[PDB]
Structure 1
């Protein structure tokens, strides 16, 4: 039942709308990454709200965790696509936005991309199944909260616990749980580097010819700083 649900609500492919007939440029690549992220958010919200038990959370907490977890969710999903689609040879951000090393360098996000490629390879090395991927991704939505707590911390704690239990079941074991939790923890530092990058870019957006979509600009200026300043922190297993 649980896996049936995750499979059913998994979003289809989301395209960036990038012009691949134009020579690569920092401005063009970043405008496309921004647009892609904005398009993806729309689906992340619909996805999250259709997750088992998600509606139990206080309305404010729902929006909050989606926004805090947004980067991590996409890093994880992107690494999986890269693994399944091109065996981690390139970063599959979208069917029309595939990054080779040249693009990684021109985007000025090289270090972050390399780390995501390593994550992509991990899916292969650990032979992560599509079902483990789905459950781990759902768990990622419940892996970052305010140090001060949510409006209804109890409901969140209950939900996170239940999702960990579903991962347990899909595994059923100790060694596997160790690997998977270690993998999940690895997503956080990567999302952090991207959060920092996004924040720095927004602040200087008017000087690099980059354009930021409405929702993304709000989240980067309201939510991301809470993460970078340590007011909102990921939940690590280890």
Structure 2
């Protein structure tokens, strides 16, 4: 049980946004609160990642980058799970103090993207994704997007990803006395992982675009946000850093 012992043991607790629920819903407040939530969620992903099995084989700057490139898809992924498990995918459960209803979806101007993220949530229920399946997939997300140019030491990354792909394959919810079953379960879960990437890309696009006009619209971006968004995110949007897909796109 050792691998999943780890994952569950290091799975972060509740991160609040700091949001002031008892004021008017508005774009500037909704998005200033998400940027503080993203900033906090980051700090936790950092410690979560660093405690992952085998993670510190990676070169130190690879570690940071990997985290930076994966940070949005992971947040989104875990977010969707919170929304699955807390509200049964009706609303987006960013935080206990930041739960997006339809109305906030519109006011945040992220309706198109919230829709996708919510669809994602619903897949968890449709597919009856087990909590165990969720953690393994989420851990695997960390290792699903790299510079095409390669990492400072790619050898150890491939070894981890391979090993993390292996661990998910053991734990899939399936009839082991039936070929088609586990075969089928894997395919589904791989597709689901793949489906996280286009959504992350949309959020990147939006946050980046948003950052550029942040001075105008007075949406506050934290230290590490602006650092990531202006430096790492554009590499992804420029096609320098690409997601590792299971299936061809």
Other structure's SS at 1:21 match: coil
| Cα-to-partner distance string for 1:50-85 (whole Å, 9 max, x where unaligned) | 000000001110000000000000010000000000
Partner of 2:179: none
Cα distance between partner residues in 1 of 2:189 and 2:133? 9
What is the CA-CA distance between 1:215 and the residue it aligns to?
0.2
What is the CA-CA distance between 1:44 and the residue it aligns to?
0.5
Partner of 2:176: none
Other structure's SS at 1:63 match: helix
Cα distance between partner residues in 2 of 1:203 and 1:26? 16
Other structure's SS at 1:151 match: coil
| Cα-to-partner distance string for 1:186-221 (whole Å, 9 max, x where unaligned) | 000000000000000111101111110000000001
Deviates more, 1:64-73 or 1:165-174: 165-174
Match of 1:233 among 235, 242, 247: 242
Other structure's SS at 2:156 match: helix
What is the CA-CA distance between 1:23 and the residue it aligns to?
1.0
Other structure's SS at 1:196 match: helix
Other structure's SS at 1:218 match: helix
Other structure's SS at 2:20 match: coil
| Cα-to-partner distance string for 1:77-103 (whole Å, 9 max, x where unaligned) | 000000000000100000000000000
Partner of 1:134: 135
Other structure's SS at 2:25 match: coil
Match of 2:220 among 202, 211, 235: 211
| Cα-to-partner distance string for 1:153-177 (whole Å, 9 max, x where unaligned) | 0100000000000001102711000
For the aligned residue pairs, the C-alpha RMSD in angstroms reads 0.6
The aligned runs of 1:131-210 (5 Å cut-off) are 131-171=132-172, 173-210=182-219
What is the CA-CA distance between 1:8 and the residue it aligns to?
0.3
Give unpaired runs (5+ residues) of structure 1: none
What is the CA-CA distance between 1:129 and the residue it aligns to?
0.2
Q: TM-score by structure 2 length?
A: 0.95
What is the CA-CA distance between 1:142 and the residue it aligns to?
0.1
Q: How many residues align?
A: 238
Q: TM-score by structure 1 length?
A: 0.99
Cα distance between partner residues in 2 of 1:218 and 1:42? 14
Match of 2:230 among 216, 221, 232: 221
Give unpaired runs (5+ residues) of structure 2: 174-181
